[PDB]
């Protein structure tokens, strides 16, 4: 299950114009949000008793300082780049960064940067590198970024050293909460919807996220449309696996496969 728990450090930076800007951030260990970073705060809030991992209060405060410095400079850099290139506002930047630990103490890391919802560049090994699609103005932006030796060192330090060590401690600290199973409640219903009905198979209050819900004719799958797995404020999930059918077909079942049921499935007939 180690692969199902990567650390994703997410940054959203909105620049409406030359004056207005805000940068907010989150941390996800697998499907669990472990941290939050508001623009109105000097520090990075921990949302779980185990969110610090195995890091000491002073080890955590060094990271707080790195992040605060990173934030203010990141805004500075973008405002400067948009001025040098004449990239007119409003600008939105996003960062997906972190790592994933593998067995035998090996890891995999990443640093992806998007501009207006499109990938533009990534950190690769020791330096920034542009995406394959990436416009020509990005190659100039990277040239200036790759000149900064200190930054390339810190991001190598965070991605290669801090991150693998962080998540190993998060996995040991949060072991209990990460292993929880919450069984779903399932029911069928008349989903409102020419000459067609919507069959709705409700699956709710399940944990963790992986679920397989499918409409069946027993031993015969259909053109099942399980929609988004929607979130609940208690970290459980909700799913409406729906089937668009012609009037009658009234000999179809719903098969619900989830980890909390321990190998057995919930079958609902109608």
């Amino acid at each position, epitope marked *: 299950m180690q692969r199902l728990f990567p650390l994703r450090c997410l940054q959203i930076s909105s620049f409406a114009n030359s004056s207005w800007t805000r940068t907010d951030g989150l941390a996800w260990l697998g499907e669990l949000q472990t941290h939050s970073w508001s623009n109105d705060s000097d520090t990075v809030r921990s949302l779980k008793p185990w969110s610090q991992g195995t890091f000491s209060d*002073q080890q955590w*405060e*060094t*990271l707080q*300082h790195i992040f605060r410095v990173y934030r203010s400079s990141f805004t500075r850099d973008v405002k400067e780049f948009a001025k040098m290139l004449r990239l007119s506002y409003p600008l939105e930047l996003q960062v997906s960064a972190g790592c994933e630990v593998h067995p035998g103490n090996a890891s995999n890391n990443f640093f992806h940067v998007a501009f207006q919802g499109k990938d533009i560049l990534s950190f690769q090994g020791t330096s920034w590198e542009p995406t394959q699609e990436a416009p020509l103005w990005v190659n100039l932006a990277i040239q200036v970024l790759n000149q900064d030796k200190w930054t390339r060192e810190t991001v190598q*330090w965070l991605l*290669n*050293g*801090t*991150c693998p060590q962080f998540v190993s401690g998060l996995l040991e600290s949060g072991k209990s909460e990460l292993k929880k199973q919450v069984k779903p409640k399932a029911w069928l219903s008349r989903g409102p919807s020419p000459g067609r009905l919507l069959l709705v198979c409700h699956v709710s209050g399940f944990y963790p996220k992986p679920v397989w819900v499918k409409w069946m004719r027993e031993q015969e799958q259909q053109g099942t449309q399980p929609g988004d797995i929607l979130p609940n404020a208690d970290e459980t999930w909700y799913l409406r696996a729906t089937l668009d059918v012609v009037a009658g077909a009234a000999g179809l079942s719903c098969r619900v496969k989830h980890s909390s049921l321990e190998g057995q499935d919930i079958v609902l007939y109608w």
Partner: nanobody
Amino acid sequence: VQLVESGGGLVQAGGSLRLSCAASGSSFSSYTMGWFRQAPGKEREIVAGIRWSDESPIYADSVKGRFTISRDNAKNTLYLQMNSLKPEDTAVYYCAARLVPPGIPIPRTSESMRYWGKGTLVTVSS
């Protein structure tokens, strides 16, 4: 961000000298501090490095058991207590700082420290 070293001078062999370093910035306690030295001809090497309270500091084999590094987070100052000095210890002593994240060991090379003072001059005779 800004560091100033003080305590350099002339010391006789077997002597003792206490260098000090003043930091200008905020959250001094989260910065890694280091004492580096450069003798005429020879490259700029490390003498002592220090980071978190729980963490043991690092030393160069030549200055192990003779020199001691310490910090006074409140006084925002870094110290180097040089004891049983040799003429070999004649060098320009620099004060260095850097933000080093938790998963990484205190750096031994000068290329890894970002803030450098203008340095102090220490000379040992006999």
